[PDB]
């Protein structure tokens, strides 16, 4: 048996008497002594996801210590509630961090390579070894067989997509010099195309490719040929006999470290930002999902997503399609913001109207709290 009773609270850095407190290392120590399966604790902390089987037990434990060590979630600031408050913030603020996800590329026409009915349908049909869409970006599977990734690559390649209202909005805030940084999890490289200057591409992009062995870098235009013919692009230097000599695009696959430029940028912007805005991301993947909990709690946070975030407390929640909400905010902002679109032939048949659900919530078109 073990020393722990299960009611302990694990601290990092009716209940009328204090519960015992353990460190995450002490906790995991105990569970090692019992020899409990880490997958269990992992399923208790994260019930909605299964760790890939190629994970050694010790790694899983390291992941558990990680999870247990994560910062305290932010208490919603009751000063800030309304969309009015929100625009007042977007005007007064001087060092704004914008955290984006696929929601800023919805209007751009990029297929859902994250859903199970998108490209994943035909790909799964062709490669039945693929468990789920995310495996398309699993580094171990890629090593094993990069075919599905490149059968898929040409579908989302950086040559044929146009920026959204959101991109343009962010780029404009950058011109005006209010944008401290735009952290994006997108790999579509549209942030650049829209002319945002201070971007950090947290999960990489198709901008370059690099051999798996010798780290030989090339431009996206060097590999574009092989990719559009659906041929796995090989390395120039590496001997042909070597099979893993593949030009892998520099997007952060699952199980890979994020670029050091990211961690640097976060350590800097950590104590400078005066407004955080999450746009078009539900924040499911770590460590990026940790960012809102990582900045000073007094900094106001604003959410612009299709769905609320259960695991996170924002001051103002605008729930709906991103471009719609952004458009609304533009109209309230005036100036170059109101002037901001070149594709409003599709925003003229989408409701301008929203419904306010006190004190925080606003429901726009394209929202789904299903």
């Amino acid at each position: 048996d073990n020393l722990l009773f299960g009611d302990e609270i694990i601290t990092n850095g009716s209940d009328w008497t204090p519960r015992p407190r353990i460190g995450p290392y002490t906790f995991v120590q105990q569970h090692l002594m019992i020899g409990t399966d880490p997958r269990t604790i992992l399923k208790d902390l994260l019930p909605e996801t299964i760790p890939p089987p190629e994970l050694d037990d010790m790694t899983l434990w390291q992941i558990v210590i990680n999870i247990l060590s994560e910062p305290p979630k932010r208490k919603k600031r009751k000063d800030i509630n309304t969309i009015e408050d929100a625009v007042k913030l977007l005007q007064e603020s001087k060092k704004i961090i914008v955290l984006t996800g696929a929601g800023v590329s919805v209007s751009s026409g990029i297929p859902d390579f994250r859903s199970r009915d998108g490209i994943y349908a035909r790909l799964a049909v062709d490669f039945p070894d693929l468990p789920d869409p995310q495996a398309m970006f699993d580094i171990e599977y890629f090593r094993k067989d990069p075919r599905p990734f490149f059968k898929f690559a040409k579908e989302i390649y950086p040559g044929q997509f146009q920026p959204s209202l959101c991109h343009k909005f962010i780029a404009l805030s950058d011109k005006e010099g209010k944008l401290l940084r735009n952290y994006t999890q997108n790999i579509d490289t549209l942030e650049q195309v829209a002319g945002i200057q201070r971007i950090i591409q947290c999960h990489g992009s198709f901008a370059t490719a690099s051999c798996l062995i010798c780290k030989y870098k090339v431009d996206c235009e060097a590999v574009r040929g092989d990719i559009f013919n659906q041929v796995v692009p090989r390395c120039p230097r590496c001997p042909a006999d070597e099979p893993l000599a593949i030009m892998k695009p520099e997007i952060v696959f699952f199980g890979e470290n994020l670029p050091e430029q990211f961690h640097r940028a976060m350590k800097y912007d950590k104590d400078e930002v005066d407004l955080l805005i999450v746009i078009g991301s539900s924040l499911k993947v770590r460590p990026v999902a940790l960012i809102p909990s990582s900045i000073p709690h007094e900094v106001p946070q604003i959410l612009i997503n299709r769905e609320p975030l259960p695991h996170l407390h924002f001051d103002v929640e605008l729930l709906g399609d991103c471009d719609v909400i952004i458009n609304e905010l533009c109209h309230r902002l005036g100036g170059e913001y109101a002037k901001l679109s070149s594709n409003p032939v599709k925003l003229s048949e989408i409701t301008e109207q929203y419904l306010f659900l006190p004190p925080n919530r606003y429901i726009f078109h394209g929202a789904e709290v299903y």
Binding site: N66, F253, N257, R286, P287
Partner: peptide, 4 residues
């Protein structure tokens, strides 16, 4: 320790 901070892998994606």
């Amino acid at each position: 320790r901070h892998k994606k």
